[PDB]
RNA sequence: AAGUCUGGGCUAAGUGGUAAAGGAUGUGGCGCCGCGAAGACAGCCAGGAGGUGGCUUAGAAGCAGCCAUCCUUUAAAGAG
RNA sequence: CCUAAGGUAGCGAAAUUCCUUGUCGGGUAAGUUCCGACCUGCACGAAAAGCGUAACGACCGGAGCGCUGUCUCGGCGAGGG
RNA sequence: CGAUCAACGGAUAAAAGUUACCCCGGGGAUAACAGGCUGAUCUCCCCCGAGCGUCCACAGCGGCGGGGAGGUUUGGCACCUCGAUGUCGGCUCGUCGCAUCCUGGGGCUGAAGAAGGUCCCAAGGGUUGGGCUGUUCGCCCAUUAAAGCGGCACGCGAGCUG
RNA sequence: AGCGCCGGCCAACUCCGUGCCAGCAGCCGCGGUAAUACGGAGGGCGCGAGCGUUACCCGGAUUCACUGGGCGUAAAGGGC
RNA sequence: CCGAGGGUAGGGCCCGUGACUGGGGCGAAGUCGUAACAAGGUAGCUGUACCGGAAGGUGCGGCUGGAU
RNA sequence: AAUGCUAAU
RNA sequence: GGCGCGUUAACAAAGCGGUUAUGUAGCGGAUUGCAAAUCCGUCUAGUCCGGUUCGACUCCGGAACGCGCCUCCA
């Protein structure tokens, strides 16, 4: 929801070291823009380039209403300029990718023993008169999923029931942590895509001091101000077409 | 007298050659199937490009048995093999032709289309 | 083996003759205030209304959730 | 950081894998076994040899065909008791 | 004066393992099976009524806590049995309990009908065949009115299997 | 009266919009804010009850060479 | 007797398909190095052999399509 | 001795 | 569960009852067309709780966490 704290992932796209340099240009843009909006920023993952850029930078935006504003910057951002890494004064079209995500909880995972069945039974293998007559072997079933764990590592039904429940949780936890990864992944590829020059959401053309946002048909010429944080123009212009979009029917 | 494991020839053109009985669909625990009784079977042998294929779990009605069938007029009939026509859940045949004779019992048990398509009814 | 012994009382569950939180117009007995022929309690005969909803709601308008629950014909009628 | 040096080729859920009936594929109507793969090998590994190998085996697995009183499910008959 | 004779009343100046190749003398003075006592564990049933259930605590549910029953499991204890109480599973043969899987009879339903849910009465009878595994248990296939859970030395080896 | 075409091959050019987007394409290549190469327009070229596209055959291909090719280093002398 | 064809059993060739596996082509950006083209900074290339994350390195012989 | 330099006439 | 070991900064990893560990990173500077390599400088610490002591990262006890080994005759 638009009121949650958000997490911005800026990755470097097509363009090599200049892509990483432009990635840093996006990075300082959002940090400064955030500070002007009140939101706190903390970096979590940075991968700098010795030329000053970032292969990838992940930072959170801590403030009431971060996903409301920053959500509009998810996509491929196109730069066109004469790179500092170019020697023959050429204009290279490079790109960066920015992913914006709602900050996840953590949500402690616990077994609901009412959807868990525990079977006890005689074990297998050695043990003489003991193994013959002892219900030391444990099964544990997560009844909704059906996934089970068995254990007869010890001679104690209690130590075995404990080791089996512990494993059932650890396994269920991984299944839960993995369906989320799929969600976190399909969602990123809905924003970043391949990172190509096309799929662009907004071009920053330095030779013509222009910044165009191709979704709404908006362009300004305050490029120095855009790349410094004064993004509030384009956001409002985006919000407008979004409200004009919500017109039924 | 057909039971689980019993192999039956297939007297239709579904492409099935041999079905192996796996259930007598007669109440809770019928031991044997005779003429007119539906069984469940898996298709053990078939021919290429037919409707049914090796491995399907189909239904079928027994049409010919090697154990003689007895009759109220004191006679009895005996066939050289165990045969079945593969059917659908509404008890209708799934092929379009029935090969060989069939027991007249099938008439009195609702299998007219099978009795119709059969070349001889004994 | 020795009382179908005497006198007073309780129990109706064969309780006696196997159990707990807890539930109960079981039964008996003590209390303590309360209301009554300023006609009580029960039943029955009515009045049981009106401005009509107040935030919320397309109706929620006496009869979802929130706000406090104003007053008159009065013998009393609650915005219930 | 440590060690005397940090498992090479080959092989691997194995006569070795605890979690385990791992996972995927095959076979079956259905396969904790089996076969083929994968490799986070609890706890393979190179003459206490490693990986293969035609032939051989009253060795030990898995499957099909044939055929059966093993079985559904028992019946009768013979002789010695 | 010389003792971590520290196993500290200190066996020698001087001493570690292993036995499924094992042995004898003993013990139910003491473990593993079963029984017994107990009932933490296990199974079942209640009390309370926060909250859910559009509305509505109680159709179906029941936070935090509370009280019990049973004697299938895992334990505690070490009381008969160590001059022997044969131990898993299967097979065979049953019999009992009822906290009932089906079938019979009911009340409530968030029960239109059909089909369910839930609880009450009820133990007469019934409660299938297969794949995997030594398995019990469990999964799966195909059915079924249903494919019940327990006790009987985890029933039953002077009945069989192994 | 329509259809194809107007960067070069190849006959036929200008204005607007677009801005490596949308698109063009047989090859070489066009398009990233002054595009005869995209789209439309005016004009032009070619054919005309037809004009284009696709598939295939032969040609261009002396690029399987009989006509009519090659093998030191371009593909190509067999290790002897 | 022959005989369409049906059945049985064992071979041959071909096509599709298969967990997994092997490399190959491709890519306006990634990671590690820098083997080759200058004597490419150890002349290169070569057949083979052994070894190595990788390009490669080294041994033996060969070639000049090698510099000064 | 001494490594590297992406991508738009 | 028993027994043993540990917990230090960005990471890895040491000594120590009072006190610049160290390596590599990171930061400032140089060199370089630029990046590295290189050179000159530089810097961030001891898991919680309770003890002992003048003073505890250091010693004693407990907790959490991680590692190692054992869990056998039935
Ligand atoms: K032993
Ligand atoms: Mg990264
Ligand atoms: Mg350059
Ligand atoms: Mg339970
Ligand atoms: Mg056991
Ligand atoms: Mg076993
Ligand atoms: Mg043993
Ligand atoms: Mg026991
Ligand atoms: Mg047939
Ligand atoms: Mg077929
Ligand atoms: Mg088959
Ligand atoms: Mg098949
Ligand atoms: Mg048919
Ligand atoms: Mg036939
Ligand atoms: Mg009397
Ligand atoms: Mg008297
Ligand atoms: Mg009573
Ligand atoms: Mg009594
Ligand atoms: Mg009583
Ligand atoms: Mg009571
Ligand atoms: Mg009382
Ligand atoms: Mg090893
Ligand atoms: Mg080595
Ligand atoms: Mg080697
Ligand atoms: Mg290896
Ligand atoms: Mg393996
Ligand atoms: Mg396996
Ligand atoms: Mg192996
Ligand atoms: Mg092993
Ligand atoms: Mg295993
Ligand atoms: Mg195992
Ligand atoms: Mg399985
Ligand atoms: Mg399969
Ligand atoms: Mg087959
Ligand atoms: Mg499988
Ligand atoms: Mg088997
Ligand atoms: Mg295998
Ligand atoms: Mg694995
Ligand atoms: Mg070995
Ligand atoms: Mg050795
Ligand atoms: Mg060995
Ligand atoms: Mg050796
Ligand atoms: Mg050997
Ligand atoms: Mg081998
Ligand atoms: Mg060989
Ligand atoms: Mg061999
Ligand atoms: Mg062999
Ligand atoms: Mg042999
Ligand atoms: Mg042998
Ligand atoms: Mg021999
Ligand atoms: Mg067979
Ligand atoms: Mg066989
Ligand atoms: Mg067979
Ligand atoms: Mg017999
Ligand atoms: Mg006999
Ligand atoms: Mg006799
Ligand atoms: Mg000592
Ligand atoms: Mg002593
Ligand atoms: Mg001593
Ligand atoms: Mg003393
Ligand atoms: Mg002495
Ligand atoms: Mg001495
Ligand atoms: Mg001694
Ligand atoms: Mg000894
Ligand atoms: Mg011994
Ligand atoms: Mg031994
Ligand atoms: Mg031995
Ligand atoms: Mg011996
Ligand atoms: Mg002996
Ligand atoms: Mg002896
Ligand atoms: Mg002995
Ligand atoms: Mg003895
Ligand atoms: Mg003795
Ligand atoms: Mg004694
Ligand atoms: Mg005793
Ligand atoms: Mg003693
Ligand atoms: Mg004992
Ligand atoms: Mg015991
Ligand atoms: Mg004992
Ligand atoms: Mg015990
Ligand atoms: Mg016993
Ligand atoms: Mg005992
Ligand atoms: Mg006893
Ligand atoms: Mg109890
Ligand atoms: Mg008790
Ligand atoms: Mg309890
Ligand atoms: Mg109760
Ligand atoms: Mg209640
Ligand atoms: Mg509610
Ligand atoms: Mg209600
Ligand atoms: Mg509860
Ligand atoms: Mg209690
Ligand atoms: Mg109790
Ligand atoms: Mg209790
Ligand atoms: Mg309890
Ligand atoms: Mg008991
Ligand atoms: Mg008992
Ligand atoms: Mg014990
Ligand atoms: Mg016990
Ligand atoms: Mg005692
Ligand atoms: Mg004994
Ligand atoms: Mg005796
Ligand atoms: Mg005796
Ligand atoms: Mg004896
Ligand atoms: Mg005896
Ligand atoms: Mg009852
Ligand atoms: Mg009933
Ligand atoms: Mg009923
Ligand atoms: Mg009912
Ligand atoms: Mg009904
Ligand atoms: Mg009820
Ligand atoms: Mg009954
Ligand atoms: Mg079986
Ligand atoms: Mg089988
Ligand atoms: Mg089983
Ligand atoms: Mg099992
Ligand atoms: Mg029913
Ligand atoms: Mg059912
Ligand atoms: Mg069954
Ligand atoms: Mg029983
Ligand atoms: Mg027993
Ligand atoms: Mg039993
Ligand atoms: Mg027994
Ligand atoms: Mg007995
Ligand atoms: Mg025996
Ligand atoms: Mg037995
Ligand atoms: Mg006996
Ligand atoms: Mg006996
Ligand atoms: Mg006996
Ligand atoms: Mg044995
Ligand atoms: Mg044996
Ligand atoms: Mg044209
Ligand atoms: Mg032309
Ligand atoms: Mg021209
Ligand atoms: Mg065109
Ligand atoms: Mg542009
Ligand atoms: Mg323009
Ligand atoms: Mg231009
Ligand atoms: Mg233009
Ligand atoms: Mg053109
Ligand atoms: Mg044009
Ligand atoms: Mg041609
Ligand atoms: Mg030609
Ligand atoms: Mg050619
Ligand atoms: Mg010629
Ligand atoms: Mg030529
Ligand atoms: Mg030559
Ligand atoms: Mg012939
Ligand atoms: Mg023929
Ligand atoms: Mg024929
Ligand atoms: Mg093939
Ligand atoms: Mg090089
Ligand atoms: Mg070289
Ligand atoms: Mg160089
Ligand atoms: Mg070099
Ligand atoms: Mg070189
Ligand atoms: Mg030199
Ligand atoms: Mg060489
Ligand atoms: Mg070397
Ligand atoms: Mg170097
Ligand atoms: Mg590099
Ligand atoms: Mg490179
Ligand atoms: Mg370049
Ligand atoms: Mg330390
Ligand atoms: Mg550390
Ligand atoms: Mg050190
Ligand atoms: Mg030290
Ligand atoms: Mg200090
Ligand atoms: Mg310093
Ligand atoms: Mg330092
Ligand atoms: Mg520096
Ligand atoms: Mg520099
Ligand atoms: Mg302290
Ligand atoms: Mg202190
Ligand atoms: Mg500390
Ligand atoms: Mg401590
Ligand atoms: Mg031992």
UniProtKB/Swiss-Prot annotation, chain A:
Organism domain of life: Bacteria
Entry GO CC: cytoplasm
Compartment list: Cytoplasm
PTM info: Methylated by PrmC. Methylation increases the termination efficiency of RF1.
Modification sites for N5-methylglutamine: 129
Keyword terms, alphabetized: Cytoplasm, Methylation, Protein biosynthesis
GO molecular function, one term: translation release factor activity, codon specific
Function: Peptide chain release factor 1 directs the termination of translation in response to the peptide chain termination codons UAG and UAA.
Family designation: Belongs to the prokaryotic/mitochondrial release factor family.
Subunit structure: Interacts with the ribosome.
Protein name, as recorded: Peptide chain release factor 1
UniProt source species: Thermus thermophilus (strain ATCC 27634 / DSM 579 / HB8)
Swiss-Prot record, chain B:
Family: Belongs to the universal ribosomal protein uL14 family.
Function as written in the Swiss-Prot or TrEMBL entry: This protein binds directly to 23S ribosomal RNA.
Keywords: Ribonucleoprotein, Ribosomal protein, RNA-binding, rRNA-binding
Protein name: Large ribosomal subunit protein uL14
Pfam family, one: Ribosomal_L14
Subunit structure: Part of the 50S ribosomal subunit. Contacts protein L19. Forms a bridge to the 30S subunit in the 70S ribosome, contacting the 16S rRNA.
Keyword RNA-binding carried by entry: yes
Record organism: Thermus thermophilus (strain ATCC 27634 / DSM 579 / HB8)
Single GO cellular component term: cytosolic large ribosomal subunit
Gene3D superfamilies: Ribosomal protein L14
CDD domains attached to this UniProt entry: Ribosomal_uL14 (cd00337)
SMART domains xref list: Ribosomal_L14 (SM01374)
Keyword set includes Ribonucleoprotein: yes
Encoding gene (name): rplN
Biological process per Gene Ontology, one example term: translation
């Amino acid at each position: 929801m638009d009121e949650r704290d958000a997490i911005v992932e800026i990755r470097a796209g097509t363009g090599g070291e200049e892509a990483a340099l432009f990635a840093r240009d996006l990075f300082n843009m959002y940090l400064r823009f955030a500070e002007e909006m009140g939101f706190e920023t903390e970096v979590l993952d940075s991968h700098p380039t010795d030329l000053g850029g970032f292969s990838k930078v992940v930072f959170e935006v801590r403030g009431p209403g971060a996903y409301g504003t920053f959500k509009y910057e998810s996509g491929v951002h196109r730069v066109q300029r004469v790179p500092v890494t170019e020697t023959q004064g050429r204009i290279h079209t490079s790109t960066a990718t920015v992913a914006v995500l709602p900050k996840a909880e953590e949500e402690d995972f616990a077994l609901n023993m009412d959807e868990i069945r525990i079977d006890v039974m005689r074990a297998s293998g050695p043990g003489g008169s003991g193994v013959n007559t002892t219900d030391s072997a444990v099964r544990v079933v997560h009844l909704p999923t059906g996934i089970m764990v068995t254990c007869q590592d010890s001679r104690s039904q209690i130590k075995n029931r404990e080791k089996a429940l512990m494993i059932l949780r650890s396994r269920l936890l991984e299944m839960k942590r993995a369906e989320e990864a799929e969600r976190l992944r399909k969602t990123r590829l809905a924003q970043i895509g391949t990172g190509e020059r096309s799929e662009k959401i907004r071009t920053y053309n330095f030779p013509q001091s222009r910044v165009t946002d191709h979704r709404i048909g908006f362009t300004t010429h305050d490029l120095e101000g855009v790349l410094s944080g004064h993004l509030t123009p384009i956001l409002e212009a985006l919000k407008r077409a979004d409200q004009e979009r919500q017109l039924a029917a | 007298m057909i039971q689980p494991q019993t192999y039956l020839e297939v007297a239709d053109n579904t492409g099935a050659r041999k079905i192996m009985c796996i259930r007598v669909l007669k109440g809770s625990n019928a031991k044997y199937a005779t003429v007119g009784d539906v069984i469940v079977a898996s298709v053990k042998e078939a021919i290429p490009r037919g409707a049914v294929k090796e491995g399907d779990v189909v239904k079928a009605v027994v049409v010919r048995t090697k154990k003689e069938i007895k009759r109220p007029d004191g006679s009895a009939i005996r066939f050289d093999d165990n045969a079945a026509v593969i059917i659908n859940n509404q008890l209708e045949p799934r092929g379009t032709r029935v090969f060989g004779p069939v027991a007249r019992e099938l008439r009195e048990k609702g299998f007219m289309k099978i009795v119709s398509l059969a070349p001889e009814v004994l």
